[PDB]
Each structure stands twice: as C-alpha cells, then as structure tokens.
Design a protein around this motif. Structure first.
Motif, PDB file in Angstrom:
ATOM      1  N   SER A 127      -8.662  20.803  -7.033  1.00 54.23           N
ATOM      2  CA  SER A 127      -9.054  19.482  -6.556  1.00 54.23           C
ATOM      3  C   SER A 127      -7.846  18.595  -6.240  1.00 54.23           C
ATOM      4  CB  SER A 127     -10.013  18.785  -7.541  1.00 54.23           C
ATOM      5  OG  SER A 127      -9.352  18.335  -8.715  1.00 54.23           O
ATOM      6  N   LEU A 128      -6.660  19.006  -6.687  1.00 57.59           N
ATOM      7  CA  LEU A 128      -5.441  18.259  -6.391  1.00 57.59           C
ATOM      8  C   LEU A 128      -5.107  18.342  -4.904  1.00 57.59           C
ATOM      9  CD1 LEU A 128      -2.926  16.563  -7.203  1.00 57.59           C
ATOM     10  CD2 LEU A 128      -1.822  18.713  -7.832  1.00 57.59           C
ATOM     11  N   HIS A 129      -5.121  19.555  -4.353  1.00 55.58           N
ATOM     12  CA  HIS A 129      -4.951  19.741  -2.913  1.00 55.58           C
ATOM     13  C   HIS A 129      -6.136  19.128  -2.161  1.00 55.58           C
ATOM     14  N   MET A 130      -7.330  19.260  -2.742  1.00 54.57           N
ATOM     15  CA  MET A 130      -8.573  18.721  -2.178  1.00 54.57           C
ATOM     16  C   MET A 130      -8.542  17.202  -1.987  1.00 54.57           C
ATOM     17  SD  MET A 130     -11.622  20.966  -2.244  1.00 54.57           S
ATOM     18  CE  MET A 130     -12.845  19.974  -3.111  1.00 54.57           C
ATOM     19  N   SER A 131      -8.091  16.485  -3.015  1.00 58.97           N
ATOM     20  CA  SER A 131      -8.025  15.024  -2.976  1.00 58.97           C
ATOM     21  C   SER A 131      -6.888  14.516  -2.099  1.00 58.97           C
ATOM     22  CB  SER A 131      -7.904  14.450  -4.387  1.00 58.97           C
ATOM     23  OG  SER A 131      -9.117  14.612  -5.100  1.00 58.97           O
ATOM     24  N   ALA A 132      -5.772  15.245  -2.101  1.00 56.61           N
ATOM     25  CA  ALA A 132      -4.638  14.931  -1.233  1.00 56.61           C
ATOM     26  C   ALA A 132      -5.022  15.087   0.237  1.00 56.61           C
ATOM     27  CB  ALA A 132      -3.434  15.797  -1.577  1.00 56.61           C
ATOM     28  N   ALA A 133      -5.675  16.201   0.566  1.00 55.54           N
ATOM     29  CA  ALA A 133      -6.186  16.433   1.913  1.00 55.54           C
ATOM     30  C   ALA A 133      -7.204  15.366   2.294  1.00 55.54           C
ATOM     31  CB  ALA A 133      -6.799  17.818   2.024  1.00 55.54           C
ATOM     32  N   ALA A 134      -8.060  14.998   1.339  1.00 59.58           N
ATOM     33  CA  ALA A 134      -9.040  13.931   1.532  1.00 59.58           C
ATOM     34  C   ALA A 134      -8.357  12.618   1.898  1.00 59.58           C
ATOM     35  CB  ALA A 134      -9.898  13.756   0.288  1.00 59.58           C
ATOM     36  N   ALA A 135      -7.334  12.249   1.132  1.00 59.81           N
ATOM     37  CA  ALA A 135      -6.575  11.027   1.394  1.00 59.81           C
ATOM     38  C   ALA A 135      -5.717  11.115   2.661  1.00 59.81           C
ATOM     39  CB  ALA A 135      -5.718  10.672   0.191  1.00 59.81           C
ATOM     40  N   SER A 136      -5.509  12.332   3.158  1.00 64.05           N
ATOM     41  CA  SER A 136      -4.721  12.557   4.370  1.00 64.05           C
ATOM     42  C   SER A 136      -5.527  12.386   5.658  1.00 64.05           C
ATOM     43  CB  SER A 136      -4.078  13.945   4.344  1.00 64.05           C
ATOM     44  OG  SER A 136      -3.099  14.036   3.326  1.00 64.05           O
ATOM     45  N   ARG A 137      -6.853  12.335   5.530  1.00 66.75           N
ATOM     46  CA  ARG A 137      -7.739  12.264   6.689  1.00 66.75           C
ATOM     47  C   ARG A 137      -7.592  10.960   7.472  1.00 66.75           C
ATOM     48  NH1 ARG A 137     -11.716  15.900   7.675  1.00 66.75           N
ATOM     49  NH2 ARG A 137     -13.204  14.314   8.404  1.00 66.75           N
ATOM     50  N   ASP A 138      -7.951  11.016   8.752  1.00 65.48           N
ATOM     51  CA  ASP A 138      -7.650   9.961   9.725  1.00 65.48           C
ATOM     52  C   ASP A 138      -8.098   8.546   9.345  1.00 65.48           C
ATOM     53  OD1 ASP A 138      -6.339  11.819  11.379  1.00 65.48           O
ATOM     54  OD2 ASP A 138      -8.190  12.317  12.440  1.00 65.48           O
ATOM     55  N   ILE A 139      -9.196   8.437   8.597  1.00 70.06           N
ATOM     56  CA  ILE A 139      -9.711   7.132   8.171  1.00 70.06           C
ATOM     57  C   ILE A 139      -8.663   6.348   7.372  1.00 70.06           C
ATOM     58  CG2 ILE A 139     -10.891   8.108   6.141  1.00 70.06           C
ATOM     59  CD1 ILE A 139     -13.136   5.818   7.051  1.00 70.06           C
ATOM     60  N   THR A 140      -8.005   7.034   6.443  1.00 74.03           N
ATOM     61  CA  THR A 140      -6.960   6.452   5.615  1.00 74.03           C
ATOM     62  C   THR A 140      -5.748   6.093   6.470  1.00 74.03           C
ATOM     63  OG1 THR A 140      -7.710   7.733   3.693  1.00 74.03           O
ATOM     64  CG2 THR A 140      -5.470   6.835   3.602  1.00 74.03           C
ATOM     65  N   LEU A 141      -5.405   6.978   7.402  1.00 74.97           N
ATOM     66  CA  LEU A 141      -4.285   6.755   8.306  1.00 74.97           C
ATOM     67  C   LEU A 141      -4.538   5.551   9.205  1.00 74.97           C
ATOM     68  CD1 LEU A 141      -3.515  10.454   9.340  1.00 74.97           C
ATOM     69  CD2 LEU A 141      -2.165   9.030   7.782  1.00 74.97           C
ATOM     70  N   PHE A 142      -5.732   5.487   9.790  1.00 76.15           N
ATOM     71  CA  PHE A 142      -6.091   4.376  10.669  1.00 76.15           C
ATOM     72  C   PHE A 142      -6.118   3.069   9.895  1.00 76.15           C
ATOM     73  CE2 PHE A 142      -7.883   7.336  13.966  1.00 76.15           C
ATOM     74  CZ  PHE A 142      -7.123   6.845  15.016  1.00 76.15           C
ATOM     75  N   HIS A 143      -6.655   3.123   8.679  1.00 80.34           N
ATOM     76  CA  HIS A 143      -6.708   1.960   7.808  1.00 80.34           C
ATOM     77  C   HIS A 143      -5.306   1.487   7.445  1.00 80.34           C
ATOM     78  CE1 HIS A 143      -8.477  -0.835   4.948  1.00 80.34           C
ATOM     79  NE2 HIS A 143      -7.564  -0.440   4.078  1.00 80.34           N
ATOM     80  N   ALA A 144      -4.389   2.437   7.292  1.00 78.65           N
ATOM     81  CA  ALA A 144      -3.001   2.128   6.985  1.00 78.65           C
ATOM     82  C   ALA A 144      -2.320   1.412   8.146  1.00 78.65           C
ATOM     83  CB  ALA A 144      -2.249   3.392   6.625  1.00 78.65           C
ATOM     84  N   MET A 145      -2.591   1.869   9.367  1.00 77.59           N
ATOM     85  CA  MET A 145      -2.036   1.252  10.574  1.00 77.59           C
ATOM     86  C   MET A 145      -2.522  -0.190  10.717  1.00 77.59           C
ATOM     87  SD  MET A 145      -0.078   3.577  12.144  1.00 77.59           S
ATOM     88  CE  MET A 145       0.022   3.403  13.923  1.00 77.59           C
ATOM     89  N   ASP A 146      -3.805  -0.409  10.423  1.00 74.58           N
ATOM     90  CA  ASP A 146      -4.407  -1.742  10.440  1.00 74.58           C
ATOM     91  C   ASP A 146      -3.772  -2.633   9.380  1.00 74.58           C
ATOM     92  OD1 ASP A 146      -6.037  -0.608  12.375  1.00 74.58           O
ATOM     93  OD2 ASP A 146      -7.795  -0.439  11.076  1.00 74.58           O
ATOM     94  N   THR A 147      -3.593  -2.083   8.180  1.00 77.45           N
ATOM     95  CA  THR A 147      -2.967  -2.796   7.064  1.00 77.45           C
ATOM     96  C   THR A 147      -1.588  -3.337   7.456  1.00 77.45           C
ATOM     97  OG1 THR A 147      -4.177  -1.479   5.409  1.00 77.45           O
ATOM     98  CG2 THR A 147      -2.214  -2.641   4.653  1.00 77.45           C
ATOM     99  N   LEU A 148      -0.789  -2.504   8.122  1.00 82.50           N
ATOM    100  CA  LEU A 148       0.517  -2.915   8.637  1.00 82.50           C
ATOM    101  C   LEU A 148       0.415  -4.095   9.599  1.00 82.50           C
ATOM    102  CD1 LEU A 148       2.490   0.411   9.273  1.00 82.50           C
ATOM    103  CD2 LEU A 148       3.376  -1.599   8.077  1.00 82.50           C
ATOM    104  N   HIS A 149      -0.501  -3.991  10.558  1.00 77.00           N
ATOM    105  CA  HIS A 149      -0.655  -5.009  11.590  1.00 77.00           C
ATOM    106  C   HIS A 149      -1.159  -6.331  11.020  1.00 77.00           C
ATOM    107  CE1 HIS A 149      -1.665  -6.921  15.416  1.00 77.00           C
ATOM    108  NE2 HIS A 149      -2.868  -7.145  14.917  1.00 77.00           N
ATOM    109  N   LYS A 150      -2.152  -6.253  10.137  1.00 78.56           N
ATOM    110  CA  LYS A 150      -2.715  -7.440   9.498  1.00 78.56           C
ATOM    111  C   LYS A 150      -1.691  -8.174   8.632  1.00 78.56           C
ATOM    112  CE  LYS A 150      -7.493  -5.885   9.680  1.00 78.56           C
ATOM    113  NZ  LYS A 150      -8.649  -5.288   8.959  1.00 78.56           N
ATOM    114  N   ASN A 151      -0.712  -7.444   8.108  1.00 76.77           N
ATOM    115  CA  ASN A 151       0.349  -8.046   7.307  1.00 76.77           C
ATOM    116  C   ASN A 151       1.631  -8.306   8.103  1.00 76.77           C
ATOM    117  OD1 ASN A 151      -1.666  -6.912   5.442  1.00 76.77           O
ATOM    118  ND2 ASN A 151      -0.242  -7.549   3.831  1.00 76.77           N
TER     119      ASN A 151
END
Ligand SMILES: [K+]
Ligand SMILES: [K+]
Ligand SMILES: [K+]
Ligand SMILES: [K+]
Ligand SMILES: [Zn+2]
Ligand SMILES: [Zn+2]
Lengths: 161, 369, 161, 369
Positions: free
Chosen positions: A65-89
């Motif tokens: 589940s360690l690789h599972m959760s890391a891969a989960a957190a690697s998915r595009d939703i988190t990435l897109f949310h991260a890009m938004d987080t940068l812009h909003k700040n």
C-alpha cells in the motif's frame, strides 16, 4: 446535400467598431485565470513543488500500500491542484506550501477512481457487464446515489486497470 | 516567441453523448492531461471559460433555437418530439444529460479567446472543446448544436476587417460556410472528403453567392490522401489565399478526423503532416485561433492536439508519452506519433492539379495590385 | 574521605582582566550555531515545515508498510534534520524546501534502528541474549563491521520495541 | 525574559562506560529528544560545542594527567597499569572506548557557555553533558575524569570578581571545592547525603582554609529528605549566601541523583522540588550556568533536565510526554512528573535547624555593611 441562402441561413455581419467606439465586453464574466505562464519561478522550483505536493498527498493518506498510496498521490488531480495552489498563492513557494498544510494537517485530493468504495466499484462492474455502456441506466439501477457525470469520470479512469 | 492562451473547463470531459455514439468529449480531458505531463500546460496562460449564456448564443442563432436547447432534457423528450424534428435533435445529434452546458463551455472558450485576440493580449488562443462546425442557424447537424466558430468570428469582425477561416476537419465546414455565404469580410477555405460522405456539400463549384462569391474556397478530396499529397496542395493554396484575401486574423479548425485510422474518417494523415498545417498557418504571424472539431479514434485525437499545442509554443516534445491518468489507453507502444497505413491514395496527381488550377483562378477574381 | 591542600590540589586562580585587556578567545573554535531562537518564522510555519519534512520522508522511502514508513519518517532524526535545514537556509521556507528536494528527488534520513538489515537485527538479538550488554564483544564476535558507537545507538532504540 | 543557550553534541549519547556500570551518557540524548518534541528546543539558541583540546584542559589539570587520558585506550590497558593506579582509572572510573572524546564534549560545552556568559551574549547557558564534579587535579574520581566545572569557573573569573557555585547533586561536590579551597573569589555551596556515603567529605566542619576559610558552605544530610524539607533549608541558606557573598555569576550543578527512586541516590525529591532550586537561583537575575551531573534512574534524569530547561525559559509544559524515539521507556504512564515515595525522612526539624544555624554563623564571618 445543399447549401442555402437567405435571412434564415446567413449571419448578420457585425460591423467594424469606430476608432472612438469600444466593444463593451466584461472579461471577468468570460474567463478566470488559472495559471500565468510568466512566473518568478523556474522549471526546477515548480518540479520540486510538485514532488512536495505529491509527498504531502502520500503522508495525508497515511494519516487515515506504500507504492499504492504514493501512486495515488501522484495522479493528475493532485498535480493539477498543486498547480492551482501555486497560482492562487501568487507563485510564492513559502506561502503555497502553507496552503498544502493548513493547520499542521495535510490535504487529500481523490479522483472518482480512488474515491469510490469497495462495494461501489463492485456495483459498477456488475452494471457494466449487464447494461454495457448505458450510463444513465447504470446509475438508475445500480448506483443511483452517484451523479451521472461522476460515473462517466469513473468509467474512463477504470478503463485503464 | 508567440504567446499562447489555453481554454479548458474540467466538466467538459464528463459530458456523454450516448451509448454507441462516436463523439466522445472525454478526448479533450485526455489532451489536457497530456499537456500537463509533457510540461506544456506550464508554458501557456491557462483560463477557465465562464459559461456562454443564451444572450451571446443568439448573436447568430435563433431566439427560439437556443430557447429550445436551454429547455430540452431527457425528461421532456417525449413532450418536445414536434420541435425535435424541426431542429434535428434526437438521432443525428442526440439528446443527452448536460447537453446545453456542453454548448456553453464550447462556445465560451471560443468567444473568450476571440475577445482575448481582439484585446491584443495574445498571439495564439487555443480551445480544443470548440470547433464544432456543422451547426446551422436554426438546427443541429453532425454532432454540432451551437456553432462556436461563427460567434467567435462575429466577435473578431469587430476589430478585424478580413477574417480567414481554415478548416482541416475531414468533413466539409458547411456551418461556417453557410453562415458567411453572402459576405466578403470572411473567407472560408475547406479541405475534405467528397463523394458519398457528409455533409454532401463543398464541391469544386461551391464558390459562394452575392458579395460572398469567390470567397468560399473548397478542395474536394477522395480516399487515402498522404501527408505528402496534402502538404503539396495545402501550402500553395493557402499562400495564394493570404496573398489575395490579405486577412488580419486567422481561425484554424483542427478537426482530428482527417487522421489515419480514424473511426469515421478515411484519410491517411499522420499527426506530423496534420500539424504541418498548423505550423504553416502559424508562420504568417496573424492573430490565430486554434479550435478542435471532429476526431473519433480518441487515442490519436489526444495525440494530435497535444502535439499541435507544442507547435503553437514551438517547443520540442519527445515521442515517449509521459505517464498520466490515461497512460494505459495508449496501446503496447505508448508513443505520441502515428505512422501512415497501407491504405491506397486515390488522389492522383492529375486530379489534385485539375482542382488546384480551378481554385487559383477563383482566387485571382479578388481585387489586388 | 579527606580534602587536601597544596599546589598539587588547588587551581591557580585566573586573574581578573583589566578594562583595557581582552580575553583573546576564538568563538568559532568553541562553537557552531545550529538554531537561532529569534526567527522571522512563527510556531505555525515551523510546525507546517516539520509536517512537510515528514511528508518528503515518507515519499522518499516510497521510491525504494504505509503507517510503517510514515512512522519511520516521523522519527527524531528526520525532525532534527528538518530543523537544521531551516537554519542552514536562513529560515527561508521557500529555500529550505528546495534543500529537501534537491533535484526533484527527496531526501532520506535513517537512524541505526531503521538502517540495519534484517540479518543484522537478528545478529544483534543473538549477541544480546548470549553476551548480555557487553557491546565490545557484541561487535567483536557478531557485528564486527559496525562501529561500536552505532551499536550503542542501535541498542537504545531497540530497547523500545 | 532571560535568553537561554543550549549546548549539545550528537555523539555524547553514544559513548558507553561499560557493562554493569550505572553512569549512562545516553540520558543526555533522551533529554535532548524530549526538548525537541516538547517544543523547547525551538525556543532556545542551540550550539554544537567544538571539542576541548588538551590546551585548555591543562588550565587546571596536570600536563601529564591529560596526556595520560589522551593516550589511554582499551588497547594499551595492560601496558599502562602502573599509571592507571596513580590516576585511579580502571575500576571506580573505568576505561572505555571514546573516553577522551566524551571529556572533550563535556568540557567544551561548559567552557563555550562560560565564554558566552562573559561575552554578555546570554543570560542563561545550559550544558547537561557537563557538571562532572568529582574530578581532581591529578586523578579521576566518581565517574568524573575532567572537571569541566572548574575550567568553566576559571574562565568566569576573567570577567567576574566573585563566582558562586551551587551543587544539588546528592554526592558532595568535592572536586569543585578542593580546586578552590584556598580562594575567596569562588564560594562553593553543597547539599548532600553524609554518613557511609561518597565521597566521604563535606561535613558541617568543612569550611575551607587560608583565604578560602568561611567560603566553602556544606549542608550534610541523612536519608529521605522531602521537597518540603529541602526547600525550607535551601532558600534561607542561599538568600544569606547571595546577601553575603554578593556574586556576579552563578554556576548551578543540577545533579539528578538527589531525585526520588534513584539507583545510586537515597533522597526523596520530586522533579518539582528539585526544579524549585533552579527557579529560585534564576530569580536572582545573575549570569547563570546550568550543568548536569549524576543521575542514575535515567527515565527520571531525562524528565528532570527536560523540566528544568522549561524553568530557564519559564514556559509551561504539560505532564503528558510528547511522542519521541524513546517514548516507550517511560513506563505504563508516560508522564513527566514523579511523586515522592513512602520512604521515611530521617532529617528531623531539630537536626536541620542545628546545622542551619551553624552555617548562618559561618556566613556572618564575611565582610559586609
Ligand atoms: K474541412
Ligand atoms: K464566404
Ligand atoms: K552536592
Ligand atoms: K572556596
Ligand atoms: Zn469531421
Ligand atoms: Zn552524584
């Protein structure tokens, strides 16, 4: 197989504005910006931030589940949310990282693929094997508590595995 | 280097036409996701288009066609059946949940980018959701309900005397043609399959009418056209178009169904040849508006528009597809580029030149010095 | 049980320096600072940073058990290293986060407890059950490739589980 | 509020005295780890002390005692056996791997903080590694090889006329006493168990000699002393000391073996009562130097010095121990505070007052106005 002429077919051509006349269009009511291309940041810093955003993601889903959760957190939703987080700040790394960990607690971002329950995923596969790709019926009969648009999103993501 | 503005709304990929239907809006989301992971997203200004209301949809369409669309749902489908036949919504263009919102995002993207172009605050603007070109003033045709392109051009006619429309989609761009059939301010150039195909218009003799005569270029084509055939007929014609029509804003519809191995299409074009058009158009340094359109082998549609965005940014991307949420869609290979098929090219050099010369003549009919 | 007097017992008392005389001591050769107490940062930001440092830690050891790796990254070594990272980067959050992810790759920090192999931990338990708490002999006979100081550090950490 | 400087080197906790030995340097690392997680580390200036070389170790000790320590190892242990008996290294104070480095960190911490105090750049300075007080000029005694305290005071005598030394350790601070036995510039005050105990010195009649007569206070004690007994004898005496001796720098040795339930100690003090001394000393607002010392139930040693650091920062910490690498050490309870035992207090009010009055007299012998 015919092209028609008349007032019921052609468009009224918009006249060219005079050098003193203005178009009168409110841009806010048309668009909102999500990312500026000209940042004080470098490709490196943004790349680093996306690693950090992913890291916070895995740690979050470690806190219930360690690789599972890391891969989960690697998915595009988190990435897109991260890009938004940068812009909003306003592209302040320091400020944007605080947005990821609001009160010493991390943020989770889960797409419909990860979000559905073990039983909901099972219901989906039964509905698909029975009703083909008829998604209105798939909800009406199998998952009527989900919105149709979520079932679409989930389907396409499930098409991978 | 030219500045690019990208328009996307997260909802678009989740609207669904119906079971068995070829038009799958998800392809836009696929492109989007690839753009992020190829690192192109990073390089362009990203905008979320606000919904386009009935107000600006009726700047071309009927007050009671839009009113029909705003009202029609899968609920009152058996109640509206009279108007469904009048507007052609129900079979060719099916009724589905969210239909109107899908039109609002598609139109909003195109308009907002046209304003962005007029306001002179971008060199290129991109909207893969838009480019739906079969829509008419009072009816839905060929999976198109609202002609976002027309409305986009009507906004550009406010700051630009002459607007050029180029259409690479395999199907003839009749909507954009018909909408501007009697004007000299907008030239519509189209390259399509002709002969037992849809929409049954756009032959050699399709030239326009009234003030719009000699202002509607058409290049009818047979099966299996190469990148090499296409290029050798696209560049000469467009050079002459720019030379004669002298436009100040271009609107390129990059319909992806002219690609090789398409579900609905029957051409033999690769992403590279298809993009050569975008690149060539880009070279004329005119306020450019890149829109989507058809495309029905979605793996390739995603590949195509991903690549063609790199063309607008003129950056290099590797053939290795970056990992993404839909990575597993992309065969055993996971590559960006497609190669052409064994398909036979029925467009003989004699046939292409016969047409080319008739079009050069028609273009000579315009004023010049 | 006796206190002695004489030159071989009492210290030569250092005379008080004149107002014009200086002690002549090099402070660098005596100390190096590891943390300044007066920072431009708040308790909140430091707390957030320690969450981020922990997050990067778990993600790192995800890149070659979810609760296990999170707890591992939560251990004091990572926390202490995070505090140092802040100080070395002059308490700039933005700069200090880049230090955690140097080239888009995270940093691992593992104490002797986590660091030892499955066989080394097994060797330790045999050595302890046989030689008691005689750590020089524990290495000389069971783990002679480890330094004595590492075996001490490992012991005390193992005393928990 | 007073500024605090903390001295620690990561290595200190990994030096090991020997199998069966009570002195376990790891206790310093435990304190350190608690300080981090209680959030106290955050609040004070943290320094890594550089090793103290033979140069400054010989500012008090023999040129050939330090030279022995620098040279002695478990290797040449059977070669040195002659000098081992002369210096008392081998049984009472065992030979172990790293021994000299352990002395360098302990001494370095104390000296660097004394300089820090003289340089007037801190109000309090803390070194839990130091405080080793049984060491003599030419021999190792009671687990102490290098008297870091003496060297710390010798540096303070450079800027301060009168230096007060207070020693809470259960064992009599004879090293610091003997080293300053004939001077009036340093007063040594000690509170310890006396009678069949170590180091056999520091009785009522231990007053000093020469210029140092009436400048070595001693409070001999029996078993089982309370916080209440201790406080009611510590405050009156120290108030008089400050009143008479009028010091300009204090050095408090906070030996943790005077705590209840100690392995080697036999007093009945809680962390709270033990800290009340630190707090009371702190109240006189003098450049203060807090050092460690003995302490052999390490769970409590860690508890004690953790708490006493909070006292220096005058911040409040909860009884709930924060999670740390050694959290599991702390019983079923996981609390900071210990409570006193059923142990009987053999220090009757008549006995304490008898001694107290003799000490008040001895202190009256000093000059005043
Ligand atoms: K076309
Ligand atoms: K026209
Ligand atoms: K004492
Ligand atoms: K004295
Ligand atoms: Zn098409
Ligand atoms: Zn002691």
């Amino acid at each position: 197989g015919e092209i028609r002429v008349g007032n019921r077919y052609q468009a009224d051509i918009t006249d060219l504005l005079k050098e003193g006349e203005e178009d009168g269009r409110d841009q806010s009511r048309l668009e909102t910006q999500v990312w500026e291309a000209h940042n004080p940041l470098t490709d490196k810093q943004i790349d680093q931030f996306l690693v950090v955003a992913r890291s916070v993601g895995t740690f979050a889903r470690a806190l219930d589940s360690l690789h599972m959760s890391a891969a989960a957190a690697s998915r595009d939703i988190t990435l897109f949310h991260a890009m938004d987080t940068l812009h909003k700040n306003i592209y302040d790394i320091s400020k944007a990282i605080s947005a990821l960990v609001p009160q010493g607690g991390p943020v989770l971002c889960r797409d419909e693929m990860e979000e559905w329950s073990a039983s909901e995923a099972n219901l989906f596969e039964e509905a698909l094997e029975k009703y083909g790709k008829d998604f209105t019926d798939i909800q009406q009969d199998f998952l009527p508590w989900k919105s149709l648009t979520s079932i679409i999103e989930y389907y396409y993501m499930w098409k991978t595995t | 280097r030219r500045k690019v503005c990208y328009y996307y709304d997260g909802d678009v990929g989740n609207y669904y036409y119906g079971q068995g239907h070829p038009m799958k809006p998800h392809r836009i989301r696929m492109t989007h996701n690839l753009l992020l992971n190829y690192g192109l997203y990073r390089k362009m200004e990203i905008y979320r288009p606000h919904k386009a209301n009935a107000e600006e949809m009726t700047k071309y369409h009927s007050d009671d066609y839009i009113k029909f669309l705003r009202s029609i749902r899968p609920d009152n489908m058996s109640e509206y059946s009279k108007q469904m036949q009048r507007f052609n919504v129900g079979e060719d263009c099916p009724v589905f949940d969210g239909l109107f919102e899908f039109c609002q995002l598609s139109t909003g993207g195109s308009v907002a980018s046209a304003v962005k172009l007029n306001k002179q605050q971008t060199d290129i603007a991109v909207n893969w959701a838009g480019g739906l070109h079969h829509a008419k003033k009072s009816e839905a045709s060929g999976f198109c309900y609202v002609n976002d392109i027309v409305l986009a051009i009507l906004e550009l006619l406010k700051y630009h005397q002459r607007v050029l429309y180029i259409d690479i989609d395999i199907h003839h761009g009749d909507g954009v043609e018909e909408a501007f059939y009697t004007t000299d301010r907008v030239m519509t150039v189209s390259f399509h399959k002709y002969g037992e195909y849809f929409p049954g218009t756009g032959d050699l003799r399709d030239i326009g009418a009234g003030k719009g005569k000699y202002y509607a270029v058409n290049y009818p084509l047979r099966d299996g056209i190469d990148d090499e055939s296409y290029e050798a007929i696209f560049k000469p014609v467009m050079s002459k178009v720019m030379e004669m029509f002298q436009p100040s804003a271009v609107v390129l519809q990059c319909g992806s169904d002219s690609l090789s191995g398409d579900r609905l299409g029957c051409f033999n074009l690769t992403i590279k040849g298809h993009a050569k058009c975008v690149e060539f158009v880009k070279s004329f340094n005119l306020p450019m508006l890149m829109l989507g359109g058809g495309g029905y082998t979605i793996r390739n549609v995603a590949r195509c528009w991903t690549y063609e965005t790199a063309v607008a940014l003129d950056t290099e991307i590797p053939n290795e597809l970056p990992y993404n949420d839909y990575f597993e869609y992309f065969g055993p290979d996971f590559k960006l580029h497609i190669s052409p098929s064994n398909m036979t090219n029925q467009n003989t050099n004699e046939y292409l030149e016969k047409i080319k010369q008739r079009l050069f003549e028609n273009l000579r009919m315009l004023p010049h010095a």
